[PDB]
Write a protein that binds this ligand. Structure first.
Ligand SMILES: [Ca+2]
Ligand SMILES: [Ca+2]
Ligand SMILES: [Cl-]
Ligand SMILES: [Cl-]
Ligand SMILES: [Zn+2]
Ligand SMILES: [Zn+2]
Ligand SMILES: [Zn+2]
Ligand SMILES: [Zn+2]
Ligand SMILES: [Zn+2]
Ligand SMILES: [Zn+2]
Ligand SMILES: [Zn+2]
Ligand SMILES: [Zn+2]
Lengths: 529, 529
């Protein structure tokens, strides 16, 4: 037989208590990632539709278009089924793109179905979510190697984790006016997704807005919540996402994605991806907080996720991801240290958002790099051509360039952009919390400002921004305040003594093109083209 | 009811697995620290005997003098024995100084003995090591308050933790000559103490000396081994301390203390400290690698250990401690960050050794601080007068002085001296290991050199150096190579950013007075006073 993910890290993360081996008769939800077809063609379409110097720019594909393009062959669907029918797979659902299948099997059924699998069960977090996973690798029978990419639910665990920043601070700094807000009578909407075991509360948002929202028109509440369950206790990550999205993109209808699938033995991020391909009418802008160490991921997983991201860009969705909170990172290989890039941040098909900080203790005059701001170079995805200019420029001109031992210069470099990541006020469990920091903060801020620009485009005769990056780089980041001072963190060692890459004049791998000066951005991204 | 140690950290350290609640009938070994007399007298005696401007300089107490001085009152001896007898404490061992008492007790009896104690058991680290400890606080009947300092074995867990550096290299750099070795027919001896689950093997020492001992006279084996009752695997640390002590202080009779007491419910370091006070004829120089975060320790424990360190100084023992391997450290107190001192390193009655590295890849011309070199300011012990001048110079004249928020200027500053800590070759389990780093490396190197100086003194009829610091500081550290470039590590935060104190032209809290230039050192410490 065949082992599709031999390179998937299977080790138990910290914060997870191991219950023993799993009960034969105990159930499990596996999600089978079915072989797609015209992937190469999709990659061409994405570029045709998102490069502005291309006649098809903005001529986005409907979900239906995407499904006609990418859906598995009839041999795939038939073979995967039946094969699943036997082995007892019970009531399953697919999606529109029909390239995913989630079923219910008893573990002893799954264990025979996926030889090598040996399910244990765990409980983890501050909160405590249940999973069923296998610390041993699995195989598919050789038969359906060309029909299944991987099986979700086997190894990857869900995530576990100056002056104070206020909405007014953000609007002042990014030159948002009291009027620079949504005229919510179009179909423009925005979303944030988050995958911890937290709940966002309607009440906390209302409280937040009462305290902070006086000087701008704002939506009372969330338009829609996807993936809710029961009664909850709020956490700061779930609150920050929504509270700041709805402040940076003020009077705009907002959807919230609340760790889909999690309450079950499922991969939340995978489930959210799956969900994107099961509804045709989606928000134009999505801000996401999610990452793994790039090196921990199987090639099959990492490549397939990248394809799902491609499918998003084809539909004119603009996807933003936090660049991470560990700087360049730190990875000890053989017997050395390297930087440690992160993923879905390292994906070429996403807008990755870095972290910024105030320069002086008491003033908001200027932005400097925030120490924690994730950035770097992929070990998996080659430099996309859209950044060829900016990246080579950085490599050839940077004085504080780290030893090339620590990274791969040929890889997709990131982040793409940045915003304040330091010292946010959030409301959670009806209490205000002072000094919340992270690139999870900057991603929704950048997101909402983008979503606001989408309104000016669609109210006009124009299509949404979609996959922004090619335009962004093409226009030399124009519009964004260019962050020039500071470096992010890395390994506590002798070579690279706590220091990763540094910010410099052009684009850089700590803050991208820098930070959103709304008026300037508007202009540039509203130019005809 | 009295709580003598409410300020002792009781939390489980990492690398420890909790078994259940301990069985009542399960025996257990407790070590009772008995109330001492005349501690302030002991203090005066130390200064009289260690201050080179004293006419009592070098006139050391005998162990029996110390015992006569310090022993508990007859009231305490009687009251403690009635008390233990009735608790069921089975046959007990004391020491010569009569201020320690180790007994065997049922767990059940320990619990009555000490209301509040609830005993759990745990297994250790890379070595499966057994302890029995209480996660809850314990108290003593009010009647015993005057008579008992504390009970050992209740909360503190044992420890779990560019060219190569060779004996050759060390001898070259510290200007040791092939003749600068021990003429082993006096009673001069030296010793190392280590507290991990590791054994040192004679074979490895022989192998080490065969490979590196080529061009200096050396001793075949360890003269004596205290604390070992079987076989095992050699550990890197146990190997390092012994191998480099016998190279720096070559052809000198050498004793190894091997984690005394560990194979029971005993605190190895405490147990080692007891043994000191149970043998009259001891080696003059002791090199010790042991450390806890200072703040983790109860007042009663930390003050008492300091006293035992005073007993050792009074007897003309030279005690050396590694300064630690996390620079200034990092401590998140309330909502803040401070440096994190270590102890016994912070004790004013010990000689603390920091860490050095070679500047260039291929040459031994110059030393630089080793990033990991422990140092700082005590929050417990105040600056001793012997270092008033040096610390004041450093405080007043250092540029790169960290935020004063991070430390306490009025505390015992350390390290006092330094030696190479980077890139040691060791033989462990008959295999040579290349890159052994640490301040546990530098301590034996310093100690060995000191022990050679003792030989020159004793031959020619002078006293041992004993507790060295007063003389060392008084003579402005001279005969040590003064280290001046580099800083040690600290918090990865936005106010300090991985950097602690920095080295400077004189004494500093990263390398002390610096590095042992033998000829010069010889000259100053062998001359008059
Ligand atoms: Ca820049
Ligand atoms: Ca110095
Ligand atoms: Cl346009
Ligand atoms: Cl003398
Ligand atoms: Zn197994
Ligand atoms: Zn279960
Ligand atoms: Zn800050
Ligand atoms: Zn250009
Ligand atoms: Zn309890
Ligand atoms: Zn036990
Ligand atoms: Zn080194
Ligand atoms: Zn002086």
């Amino acid at each position: 037989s065949y082992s599709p993910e031999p390179d998937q890290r299977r080790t138990l993360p910290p914060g997870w208590v191991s219950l023993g081996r799993a009960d034969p008769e105990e159930e499990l939800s596996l999600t089978f990632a079915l072989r797609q077809q015209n992937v190469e063609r999709l990659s061409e379409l994405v570029q045709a539709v998102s490069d502005p110097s291309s006649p098809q720019y903005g001529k986005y594909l409907t979900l239906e278009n995407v499904a006609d393009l990418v859906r598995p062959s009839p041999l795939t669907l038939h073979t995967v089924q039946k094969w699943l029918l036997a082995a007892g797979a019970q009531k399953c659902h697919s999606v529109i793109t029909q390239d995913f299948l989630t079923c219910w099997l008893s573990i002893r059924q799954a264990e025979l179905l996926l030889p090598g699998a040996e399910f244990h069960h765990y409980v983890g977090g501050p909160t405590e979510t249940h999973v069923v996973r296998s610390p041993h690798p699995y195989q598919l029978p050789q038969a359906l190697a060309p029909h299944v990419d991987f099986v979700g639910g086997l190894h990857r665990f869900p995530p576990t984790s100056h002056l104070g920043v206020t909405p007014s601070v953000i609007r002042k700094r990014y030159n948002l006016t009291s009027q620079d807000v949504g005229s919510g009578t179009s179909n423009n909407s925005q979303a944030c997704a988050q995958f911890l075991e937290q709940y966002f509360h309607d009440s906390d948002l209302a409280q937040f807005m009462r305290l902070f929202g006086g000087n701008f028109a704002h939506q009372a509440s969330v338009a829609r919540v996807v993936g809710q369950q029961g009664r909850g206790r709020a956490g700061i990550e779930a609150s920050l996402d929504v509270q700041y999205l709805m402040s940076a993109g003020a009077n705009i209808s907002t959807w919230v994605y609340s760790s889909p699938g999690r309450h079950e033995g499922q991969e939340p991020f995978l489930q959210w991806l799956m969900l994107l391909s099961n509804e045709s009418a989606l928000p134009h802008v999505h801000t996401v907080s999610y990452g793994d160490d790039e090196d921990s991921l199987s090639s099959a997983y990492i490549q397939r996720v990248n394809t799902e991201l491609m499918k998003a860009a084809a539909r004119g969705l603009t996807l933003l991801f936090a660049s991470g909170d560990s700087g360049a990172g730190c990875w000890s290989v053989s017997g050395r240290h390297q930087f440690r890039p992160t993923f879905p941040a390292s994906s070429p098909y996403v807008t990755t958002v870095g972290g910024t900080s105030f320069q002086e203790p008491f003033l908001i005059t200027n932005e400097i790099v925030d120490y924690i701001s994730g950035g770097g170079f992929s070990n998996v995805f080659p430099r996309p051509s859209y950044q060829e200019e900016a990246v080579t420029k950085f490599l050839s001109s940077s004085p504080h360039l780290p030893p090339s031992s620590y990274f791969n210069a040929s890889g997709r470099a990131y982040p793409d952009v940045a915003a304040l990541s330091d010292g946010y006020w959030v409301v959670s469990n009806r209490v205000p919390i002072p000094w919340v920091s992270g690139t999870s903060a900057s991603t929704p801020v950048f997101g909402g400002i983008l979503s606001l620009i989408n309104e000016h485009r669609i109210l006009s005769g124009r299509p949404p921004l979609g996959f922004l990056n090619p335009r962004l780089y093409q226009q030399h980041g124009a519009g964004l305040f260019d962050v020039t001072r500071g470096c992010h963190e890395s390994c506590l060692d002798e070579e690279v003594e706590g220091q990763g890459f540094c910010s410099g004049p052009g684009w850089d791998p700590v803050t991208g093109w820098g930070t959103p000066n709304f008026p300037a951005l508007l202009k540039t991204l509203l130019n005809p083209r």
